[PDB]
């Protein structure tokens, strides 16, 4: 059975998508002084029958996700009520906004250390490892879809595609799906093939973002059209394809790992179990 929405106090808009929007909410009566804060996804004001259907399917997907580094479904609104999904409020916002504020610690004003960058990335790899065990393909992994809680805890989400802050991250063509082409493997762009291996590619790009402290867009100086043509160069494999450059905060060893994520052949990209071990262990000696 479900959760009574009467108990919700809407406080702030956190995200906005095709059919839904997310609000910060206060739950009236976890100390007696402080209220309980949650994030609540509800239908958009322009929602229709179609929106309700998509909402019901998202509930089905979310009810499956039970991992420390994936957002969890705390509850849904009572049957009588307008549809809602409730999850934890992640108090430090999305990872892109959070990291963007910081600079890399100067070995010789918020700063963040290289080992903390590894810790962030490792948590993302752990969440993705779990999704891989469920044979669940994310399709839109990026730092804008990761959320930051207390003590640099990271949870992967998939939301807020219509956030104005990230409008430039999506390639929109009338009559087509909205596509995050700068994060997409070449076979996603060319054939629409999304797999765990293309989630690994997107993880490589997400790792690049983290090591750039989210201060630059992948392929930022190239046009959307140039990014799409680059996928063509991966397909043709005449050595004219290009890659994201090594971030200044990224040691060559870690960069080589990212390059493996962007292997032309899907089967040659590393599994998330391997990525996680590298980021949690091997990366520490560099
Ligand atoms: O990702 C969601 N649903 C997708 C189906 C789930 C999924 C699919 C694939 C992979 C992973 C997850 C999702 C749902 C709900 Cl109710 C709420 C949210 C957003 O929540 C927060 C919380 N705190 C925040 N602070 C600042 C912003 C912010 C946003 C996102």
From Swiss-Prot:
ATP binds at residues 14-22, 41. The modification Phosphotyrosine is found at residues 114, 166, 170-171. Expressed at low levels in most adult tissues and is highest in the brain, lung, placenta and kidney. Lower levels of expression are detected in melanocytes, heart, liver, skeletal muscle and pancreas. Abundant in breast carcinoma cell lines. In the colonic mucosa, expressed in epithelia but not in the connective tissue of the lamina propria. Residues 8-279 form the Protein kinase domain. It comes from the Eukaryota. Autophosphorylated in response to fibrillar collagen binding. The active site is at 140 (proton acceptor). Residues 1-286 are cytoplasmic. The modification Phosphoserine is found at residue 29. Homodimer. Interacts (via PPxY motif) with WWC1 (via WW domains) in a collagen-regulated manner. Forms a tripartite complex with WWC1 and PRKCZ, but predominantly in the absence of collagen. Interacts (tyrosine phosphorylated) with SHC1. Interacts with SRC. Interacts with MYH9. Interacts with CDH1. Interacts with PTPN11. Interacts with NCK2. Belongs to the protein kinase superfamily. Tyr protein kinase family. Insulin receptor subfamily. Tyrosine kinase that functions as a cell surface receptor for fibrillar collagen and regulates cell attachment to the extracellular matrix, remodeling of the extracellular matrix, cell migration, differentiation, survival and cell proliferation. Collagen binding triggers a signaling pathway that involves SRC and leads to the activation of MAP kinases. Regulates remodeling of the extracellular matrix by up-regulation of the matrix metalloproteinases MMP2, MMP7 and MMP9, and thereby facilitates cell migration and wound healing. The Gly/Pro-rich domains may be required for an unusual geometry of interaction with ligand or substrates. This is Epithelial discoidin domain-containing receptor 1. It comes from Homo sapiens. The lineage of its organism: Eukaryota, Metazoa, Chordata, Craniata, Vertebrata. The gene is DDR1. The chain holds residues 603 to 912 of 913 of the full protein.
């Amino acid at each position: 059975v479900d959760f009574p929405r009467s108990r919700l106090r809407f406080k702030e808009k956190l995200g906005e998508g095709q059919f839904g929007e997310v609000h910060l909410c206060e739950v009236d009566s976890v100390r007696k002084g402080h209220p309980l804060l949650v994030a609540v996804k509800i239908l958009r004001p322009d929602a229709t029958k179609n929106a309700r259907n998509d909402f019901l399917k998202e509930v089905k997907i979310m009810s499956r996700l039970k991992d420390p580094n994936i957002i969890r479904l705390l509850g849904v609104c009572v049957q009588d009520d307008p549809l809602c999904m409730i999850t934890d409020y992640m108090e430090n916002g999305d990872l892109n906004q959070f990291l963007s504020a910081h600079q890399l610690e100067d070995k010789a004003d918020p700063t963040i250390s290289y080992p903390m960058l590894l810790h962030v990335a490792a948590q993302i790899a752990s969440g993705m490892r779990y999704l891989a065990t469920l044979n669940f393909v994310h399709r839109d992994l990026a730092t804008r879809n990761c959320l930051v809680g207390e003590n640099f805890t990271i949870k992967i989400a998939d939301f807020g595609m219509s956030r104005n802050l990230y409008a430039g991250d999506y390639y929109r063509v009338q009559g087509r799906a909205v596509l995050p082409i700068r994060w997409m493997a070449w076979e996603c762009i060319l054939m629409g093939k999304f797999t765990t291996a293309s989630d690994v590619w997107a993880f490589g790009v997400t790792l690049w973002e983290v090591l750039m402290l989210c201060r630059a867009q992948p392929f930022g100086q190239l046009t959307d059209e140039q990014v799409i043509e680059n996928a063509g160069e991966f397909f043709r494999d005449q050595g004219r394809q290009v890659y994201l450059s090594r971030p200044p905060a990224c040691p060559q060893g870690l960069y080589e790992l990212m390059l493996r994520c962007w292997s032309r052949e899907s089967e040659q990209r590393p599994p998330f179990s391997q990525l996680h071990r590298f980021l949690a262990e091997d990366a520490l000696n560099t």
